[PDB]
Amino acid sequence: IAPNRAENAYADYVLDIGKRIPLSAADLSNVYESVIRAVHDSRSRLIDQHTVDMIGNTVLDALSRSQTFRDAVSYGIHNEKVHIGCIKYRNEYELNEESSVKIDDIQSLTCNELYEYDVGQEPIFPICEAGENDNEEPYVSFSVAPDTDSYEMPSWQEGLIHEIIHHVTGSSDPSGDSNIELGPTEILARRVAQELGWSVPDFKGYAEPEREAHLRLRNLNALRQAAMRHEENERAFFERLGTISDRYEASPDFTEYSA
Ligand SMILES: [Mg+2]
Ligand SMILES: [Zn+2]
């Protein structure tokens, strides 16, 4: 009898069961290829090439260097969860209701209104979730990627791994809001981060105020950085973010930014 998917015990269950049938080198090779394909096919729903690359780098690095991630992934493949190669990626955002910002839509946002608000009143929020589309195909929506070498990068990577773990292990977050338990999804993601040398803050609970503040500020900064990357194409940037947030396809070739 397995632990419930929302209890901390579920994390160790997943790893124990996952280690029983390890990915062969050929198995891993094929998973590696499926992820590359999946991420490449995610372009039409990601904000920019940088984010495409970073998602790819992050998942592939985790597969290459983290036994925990490989165990979680193998668990999913052999125990009727999501095969990681089936997962596509998106950068869906949502207007913040409390914001004083006066805009009808994400498309209308400007770099300015993004920088004229600190955490608490920021104009938009990323949607970070493991969901499924109409055809029941799994996707992960997550923050745009922060700049290479940014403070935000390891936390962003750990958070991305977190969402994938939902899919590939079927793990949940804690049922109630807690300051002392992380839940099995976050537990696993933290182990992966530790194995890969991603420096993330040592939080105790999934809903700890410091954790909530950290995430919000990471997201705001990742978004500011992403916008600044496309400073010359400001309208194109927010229009694409809106297109994706409305659940439409944008150019898989990012022609909106083209020289
Ligand atoms: Mg709208
Ligand atoms: Zn979660």
mmCIF file of C-alpha atoms and ligand atoms in Angstrom:
data_model
loop_
_atom_site.group_PDB
_atom_site.id
_atom_site.type_symbol
_atom_site.label_atom_id
_atom_site.label_comp_id
_atom_site.label_asym_id
_atom_site.label_seq_id
_atom_site.Cartn_x
_atom_site.Cartn_y
_atom_site.Cartn_z
ATOM 1 C CA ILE A 1 0.000 0.000 0.000
ATOM 2 C CA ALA A 2 1.425 3.330 -1.188
ATOM 3 C CA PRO A 3 1.300 6.512 0.901
ATOM 4 C CA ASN A 4 -1.258 9.114 -0.127
ATOM 5 C CA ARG A 5 0.091 11.344 -2.912
ATOM 6 C CA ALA A 6 -0.004 14.403 -0.644
ATOM 7 C CA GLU A 7 1.965 13.084 2.324
ATOM 8 C CA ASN A 8 5.724 13.477 2.751
ATOM 9 C CA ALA A 9 6.074 9.692 2.831
ATOM 10 C CA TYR A 10 5.076 9.645 -0.837
ATOM 11 C CA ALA A 11 8.447 11.023 -1.913
ATOM 12 C CA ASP A 12 10.474 8.127 -0.505
ATOM 13 C CA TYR A 13 7.892 5.650 -1.804
ATOM 14 C CA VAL A 14 8.395 7.018 -5.315
ATOM 15 C CA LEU A 15 12.188 6.743 -5.112
ATOM 16 C CA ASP A 16 12.150 3.247 -3.601
ATOM 17 C CA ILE A 17 9.748 1.952 -6.256
ATOM 18 C CA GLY A 18 11.519 3.932 -8.979
ATOM 19 C CA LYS A 19 14.881 2.325 -8.249
ATOM 20 C CA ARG A 20 13.470 -1.162 -8.867
ATOM 21 C CA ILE A 21 13.502 -0.679 -12.620
ATOM 22 C CA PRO A 22 16.292 1.786 -13.453
ATOM 23 C CA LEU A 23 16.501 3.380 -16.887
ATOM 24 C CA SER A 24 19.037 1.522 -19.013
ATOM 25 C CA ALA A 25 21.563 3.715 -20.835
ATOM 26 C CA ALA A 26 19.533 3.165 -24.010
ATOM 27 C CA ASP A 27 16.333 3.930 -22.110
ATOM 28 C CA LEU A 28 17.853 7.151 -20.833
ATOM 29 C CA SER A 29 19.140 7.984 -24.292
ATOM 30 C CA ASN A 30 15.620 7.680 -25.683
ATOM 31 C CA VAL A 31 14.095 9.717 -22.842
ATOM 32 C CA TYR A 32 16.744 12.357 -23.489
ATOM 33 C CA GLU A 33 15.649 12.526 -27.116
ATOM 34 C CA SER A 34 11.958 12.705 -26.261
ATOM 35 C CA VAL A 35 12.558 15.689 -23.962
ATOM 36 C CA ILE A 36 14.536 17.547 -26.608
ATOM 37 C CA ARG A 37 11.665 17.009 -29.049
ATOM 38 C CA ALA A 38 9.045 17.974 -26.472
ATOM 39 C CA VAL A 39 10.813 21.184 -25.571
ATOM 40 C CA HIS A 40 11.399 22.112 -29.197
ATOM 41 C CA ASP A 41 7.694 21.545 -29.879
ATOM 42 C CA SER A 42 6.895 23.845 -26.925
ATOM 43 C CA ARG A 43 8.225 26.935 -28.726
ATOM 44 C CA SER A 44 4.804 28.137 -29.848
ATOM 45 C CA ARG A 45 3.837 28.479 -26.180
ATOM 46 C CA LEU A 46 7.040 29.899 -24.694
ATOM 47 C CA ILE A 47 7.978 33.587 -24.507
ATOM 48 C CA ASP A 48 11.394 33.368 -26.160
ATOM 49 C CA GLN A 49 14.261 31.184 -27.366
ATOM 50 C CA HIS A 50 16.110 31.793 -24.104
ATOM 51 C CA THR A 51 13.301 30.154 -22.141
ATOM 52 C CA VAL A 52 13.181 27.260 -24.620
ATOM 53 C CA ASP A 53 16.909 26.660 -24.125
ATOM 54 C CA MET A 54 16.755 26.954 -20.311
ATOM 55 C CA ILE A 55 13.884 24.519 -19.955
ATOM 56 C CA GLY A 56 15.777 22.083 -22.147
ATOM 57 C CA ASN A 57 19.044 22.583 -20.286
ATOM 58 C CA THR A 58 17.346 22.225 -16.939
ATOM 59 C CA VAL A 59 15.445 19.007 -17.635
ATOM 60 C CA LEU A 60 18.321 17.363 -19.494
ATOM 61 C CA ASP A 61 20.816 18.309 -16.782
ATOM 62 C CA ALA A 62 18.485 16.827 -14.172
ATOM 63 C CA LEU A 63 18.226 13.603 -16.210
ATOM 64 C CA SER A 64 22.000 13.452 -16.672
ATOM 65 C CA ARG A 65 23.195 14.286 -13.193
ATOM 66 C CA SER A 66 20.430 13.606 -10.672
ATOM 67 C CA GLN A 67 19.777 10.012 -9.616
ATOM 68 C CA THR A 68 16.683 11.270 -7.828
ATOM 69 C CA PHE A 69 15.214 12.812 -10.946
ATOM 70 C CA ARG A 70 16.005 9.644 -12.920
ATOM 71 C CA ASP A 71 14.302 7.560 -10.225
ATOM 72 C CA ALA A 72 11.262 9.842 -10.241
ATOM 73 C CA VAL A 73 11.146 9.724 -14.030
ATOM 74 C CA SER A 74 11.552 5.973 -14.151
ATOM 75 C CA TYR A 75 8.873 5.624 -11.532
ATOM 76 C CA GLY A 76 6.443 7.459 -13.762
ATOM 77 C CA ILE A 77 7.314 5.434 -16.819
ATOM 78 C CA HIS A 78 6.895 2.080 -15.069
ATOM 79 C CA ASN A 79 4.008 2.889 -12.723
ATOM 80 C CA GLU A 80 1.372 4.483 -14.930
ATOM 81 C CA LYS A 81 2.102 8.189 -14.458
ATOM 82 C CA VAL A 82 3.363 10.632 -17.086
ATOM 83 C CA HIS A 83 6.313 9.770 -19.343
ATOM 84 C CA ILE A 84 8.458 12.893 -19.175
ATOM 85 C CA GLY A 85 8.805 13.014 -22.964
ATOM 86 C CA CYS A 86 5.059 13.640 -23.260
ATOM 87 C CA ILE A 87 5.222 16.906 -21.301
ATOM 88 C CA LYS A 88 5.082 20.238 -23.205
ATOM 89 C CA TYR A 89 5.872 23.643 -21.682
ATOM 90 C CA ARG A 90 4.093 27.016 -21.551
ATOM 91 C CA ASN A 91 4.533 30.505 -20.100
ATOM 92 C CA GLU A 92 0.943 31.353 -19.136
ATOM 93 C CA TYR A 93 0.384 34.503 -17.094
ATOM 94 C CA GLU A 94 -2.538 36.074 -15.314
ATOM 95 C CA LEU A 95 -3.510 39.637 -14.473
ATOM 96 C CA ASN A 96 -3.262 40.372 -10.754
ATOM 97 C CA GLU A 97 -6.582 41.568 -9.360
ATOM 98 C CA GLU A 98 -5.196 43.699 -6.523
ATOM 99 C CA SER A 99 -3.030 45.706 -8.928
ATOM 100 C CA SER A 100 -3.761 49.401 -9.317
ATOM 101 C CA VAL A 101 -2.267 49.102 -12.806
ATOM 102 C CA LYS A 102 -4.760 50.235 -15.432
ATOM 103 C CA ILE A 103 -4.659 47.808 -18.341
ATOM 104 C CA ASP A 104 -7.379 45.747 -19.981
ATOM 105 C CA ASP A 105 -5.002 42.922 -20.887
ATOM 106 C CA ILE A 106 -1.475 41.525 -20.775
ATOM 107 C CA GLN A 107 -1.030 42.642 -24.392
ATOM 108 C CA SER A 108 -1.242 46.255 -23.257
ATOM 109 C CA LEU A 109 1.377 45.982 -20.533
ATOM 110 C CA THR A 110 4.577 48.032 -20.782
ATOM 111 C CA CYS A 111 8.059 47.563 -19.359
ATOM 112 C CA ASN A 112 7.360 50.670 -17.291
ATOM 113 C CA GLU A 113 4.352 49.395 -15.348
ATOM 114 C CA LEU A 114 6.374 46.269 -14.679
ATOM 115 C CA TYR A 115 9.172 48.160 -12.924
ATOM 116 C CA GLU A 116 6.968 50.682 -11.131
ATOM 117 C CA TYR A 117 5.594 48.014 -8.782
ATOM 118 C CA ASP A 118 7.182 45.838 -6.113
ATOM 119 C CA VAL A 119 5.929 42.470 -4.846
ATOM 120 C CA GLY A 120 2.372 42.816 -3.555
ATOM 121 C CA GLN A 121 1.046 45.042 -6.319
ATOM 122 C CA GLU A 122 2.756 43.670 -9.430
ATOM 123 C CA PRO A 123 0.576 43.738 -12.580
ATOM 124 C CA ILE A 124 0.758 40.041 -13.543
ATOM 125 C CA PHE A 125 1.585 36.609 -12.124
ATOM 126 C CA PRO A 126 2.893 33.559 -13.883
ATOM 127 C CA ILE A 127 0.723 30.483 -13.744
ATOM 128 C CA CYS A 128 2.872 27.696 -12.307
ATOM 129 C CA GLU A 129 1.091 24.358 -12.614
ATOM 130 C CA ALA A 130 1.120 20.836 -13.936
ATOM 131 C CA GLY A 131 -2.024 20.711 -16.060
ATOM 132 C CA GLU A 132 -3.531 18.780 -18.973
ATOM 133 C CA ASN A 133 -5.024 20.194 -22.172
ATOM 134 C CA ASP A 134 -8.240 19.256 -23.965
ATOM 135 C CA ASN A 135 -6.792 16.045 -25.415
ATOM 136 C CA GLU A 136 -5.563 15.161 -21.927
ATOM 137 C CA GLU A 137 -1.929 15.842 -22.899
ATOM 138 C CA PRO A 138 0.226 16.967 -19.954
ATOM 139 C CA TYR A 139 1.847 20.402 -19.848
ATOM 140 C CA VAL A 140 3.770 22.512 -17.384
ATOM 141 C CA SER A 141 3.105 26.229 -17.213
ATOM 142 C CA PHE A 142 5.802 28.211 -15.479
ATOM 143 C CA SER A 143 7.505 31.603 -15.212
ATOM 144 C CA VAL A 144 9.476 32.886 -18.186
ATOM 145 C CA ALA A 145 13.184 32.149 -17.693
ATOM 146 C CA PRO A 146 15.366 34.686 -15.857
ATOM 147 C CA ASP A 147 18.670 35.770 -17.391
ATOM 148 C CA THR A 148 21.576 33.368 -17.503
ATOM 149 C CA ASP A 149 23.671 33.848 -14.369
ATOM 150 C CA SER A 150 20.827 35.671 -12.585
ATOM 151 C CA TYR A 151 20.237 35.214 -8.866
ATOM 152 C CA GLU A 152 16.869 33.777 -9.840
ATOM 153 C CA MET A 153 18.150 30.938 -12.042
ATOM 154 C CA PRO A 154 18.582 28.062 -9.561
ATOM 155 C CA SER A 155 15.289 28.791 -7.836
ATOM 156 C CA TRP A 156 13.584 28.935 -11.254
ATOM 157 C CA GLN A 157 15.127 25.596 -12.226
ATOM 158 C CA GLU A 158 14.110 23.933 -8.970
ATOM 159 C CA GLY A 159 10.571 25.259 -9.447
ATOM 160 C CA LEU A 160 10.398 23.934 -12.985
ATOM 161 C CA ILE A 161 11.539 20.484 -11.765
ATOM 162 C CA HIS A 162 8.866 20.716 -9.101
ATOM 163 C CA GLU A 163 6.105 21.029 -11.692
ATOM 164 C CA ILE A 164 7.437 18.159 -13.789
ATOM 165 C CA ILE A 165 7.554 15.973 -10.676
ATOM 166 C CA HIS A 166 3.804 16.498 -10.209
ATOM 167 C CA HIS A 167 3.317 14.867 -13.611
ATOM 168 C CA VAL A 168 5.896 12.115 -13.594
ATOM 169 C CA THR A 169 5.206 10.891 -10.048
ATOM 170 C CA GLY A 170 1.595 11.992 -9.508
ATOM 171 C CA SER A 171 2.739 13.590 -6.237
ATOM 172 C CA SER A 172 0.783 16.536 -4.758
ATOM 173 C CA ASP A 173 1.583 19.524 -2.552
ATOM 174 C CA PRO A 174 0.376 19.602 1.087
ATOM 175 C CA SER A 175 -3.432 19.563 1.396
ATOM 176 C CA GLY A 176 -3.471 22.347 3.964
ATOM 177 C CA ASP A 177 -1.231 25.408 3.976
ATOM 178 C CA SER A 178 1.809 24.570 6.059
ATOM 179 C CA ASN A 179 4.910 26.284 7.412
ATOM 180 C CA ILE A 180 6.516 23.037 8.549
ATOM 181 C CA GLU A 181 5.894 20.554 5.751
ATOM 182 C CA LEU A 182 7.020 20.818 2.133
ATOM 183 C CA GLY A 183 4.934 18.015 0.685
ATOM 184 C CA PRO A 184 6.405 15.194 -1.379
ATOM 185 C CA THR A 185 6.643 17.119 -4.660
ATOM 186 C CA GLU A 186 8.775 19.871 -3.158
ATOM 187 C CA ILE A 187 10.761 17.314 -1.136
ATOM 188 C CA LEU A 188 11.762 15.529 -4.367
ATOM 189 C CA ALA A 189 12.456 18.779 -6.208
ATOM 190 C CA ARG A 190 14.716 19.925 -3.366
ATOM 191 C CA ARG A 191 16.647 16.657 -3.491
ATOM 192 C CA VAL A 192 17.143 17.103 -7.213
ATOM 193 C CA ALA A 193 18.316 20.680 -6.662
ATOM 194 C CA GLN A 194 20.768 19.474 -4.024
ATOM 195 C CA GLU A 195 22.152 16.819 -6.383
ATOM 196 C CA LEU A 196 22.623 19.334 -9.204
ATOM 197 C CA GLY A 197 24.159 22.060 -7.042
ATOM 198 C CA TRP A 198 21.334 24.544 -7.558
ATOM 199 C CA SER A 199 21.467 26.936 -4.603
ATOM 200 C CA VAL A 200 17.957 27.445 -3.275
ATOM 201 C CA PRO A 201 16.821 28.799 0.102
ATOM 202 C CA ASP A 202 16.300 26.187 2.820
ATOM 203 C CA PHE A 203 12.556 26.539 3.380
ATOM 204 C CA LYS A 204 10.648 24.316 5.833
ATOM 205 C CA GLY A 205 7.048 24.670 4.586
ATOM 206 C CA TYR A 206 5.455 24.922 1.120
ATOM 207 C CA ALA A 207 3.352 27.884 2.242
ATOM 208 C CA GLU A 208 5.912 29.544 4.539
ATOM 209 C CA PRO A 209 5.597 33.355 4.190
ATOM 210 C CA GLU A 210 9.320 33.687 3.375
ATOM 211 C CA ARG A 211 8.933 31.058 0.672
ATOM 212 C CA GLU A 212 5.865 32.809 -0.749
ATOM 213 C CA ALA A 213 7.707 36.133 -0.781
ATOM 214 C CA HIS A 214 10.784 34.540 -2.348
ATOM 215 C CA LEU A 215 8.745 32.973 -5.186
ATOM 216 C CA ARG A 216 6.791 36.115 -5.895
ATOM 217 C CA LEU A 217 9.970 38.179 -6.094
ATOM 218 C CA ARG A 218 11.750 35.570 -8.211
ATOM 219 C CA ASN A 219 8.821 35.601 -10.638
ATOM 220 C CA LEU A 220 8.706 39.395 -10.823
ATOM 221 C CA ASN A 221 12.423 39.580 -11.466
ATOM 222 C CA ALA A 222 12.405 36.790 -14.033
ATOM 223 C CA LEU A 223 9.672 38.707 -15.870
ATOM 224 C CA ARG A 224 11.521 42.039 -15.677
ATOM 225 C CA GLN A 225 14.657 40.376 -16.986
ATOM 226 C CA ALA A 226 12.797 38.648 -19.815
ATOM 227 C CA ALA A 227 11.213 41.980 -20.789
ATOM 228 C CA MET A 228 14.582 43.717 -20.714
ATOM 229 C CA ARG A 229 15.976 41.012 -23.024
ATOM 230 C CA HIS A 230 13.425 42.203 -25.594
ATOM 231 C CA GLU A 231 13.577 45.891 -24.729
ATOM 232 C CA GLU A 232 13.626 46.917 -28.421
ATOM 233 C CA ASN A 233 10.552 44.728 -29.044
ATOM 234 C CA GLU A 234 8.487 45.672 -26.027
ATOM 235 C CA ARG A 235 5.105 45.512 -27.713
ATOM 236 C CA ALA A 236 5.979 42.181 -29.339
ATOM 237 C CA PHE A 237 7.036 40.776 -25.992
ATOM 238 C CA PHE A 238 3.833 41.552 -24.151
ATOM 239 C CA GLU A 239 1.679 40.638 -27.121
ATOM 240 C CA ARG A 240 3.293 37.203 -27.217
ATOM 241 C CA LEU A 241 2.936 36.745 -23.455
ATOM 242 C CA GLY A 242 -0.741 37.596 -23.863
ATOM 243 C CA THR A 243 -1.204 35.276 -26.848
ATOM 244 C CA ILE A 244 0.220 32.425 -24.829
ATOM 245 C CA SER A 245 -1.802 33.400 -21.757
ATOM 246 C CA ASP A 246 -4.960 33.335 -23.867
ATOM 247 C CA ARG A 247 -3.908 29.774 -24.832
ATOM 248 C CA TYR A 248 -3.149 30.452 -28.484
ATOM 249 C CA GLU A 249 -0.037 29.540 -30.437
ATOM 250 C CA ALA A 250 2.550 32.204 -31.071
ATOM 251 C CA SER A 251 5.249 31.855 -33.794
ATOM 252 C CA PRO A 252 7.356 28.753 -33.015
ATOM 253 C CA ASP A 253 10.160 30.695 -34.672
ATOM 254 C CA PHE A 254 9.745 33.862 -32.597
ATOM 255 C CA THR A 255 9.298 35.946 -35.743
ATOM 256 C CA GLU A 256 7.742 38.676 -33.571
ATOM 257 C CA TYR A 257 11.264 39.643 -32.427
ATOM 258 C CA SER A 258 12.989 39.229 -35.782
ATOM 259 C CA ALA A 259 15.780 41.552 -36.974
HETATM 260 MG MG MG B 1 -7.632 39.390 -22.374
HETATM 261 ZN ZN ZN B 2 3.341 21.998 -6.523
#
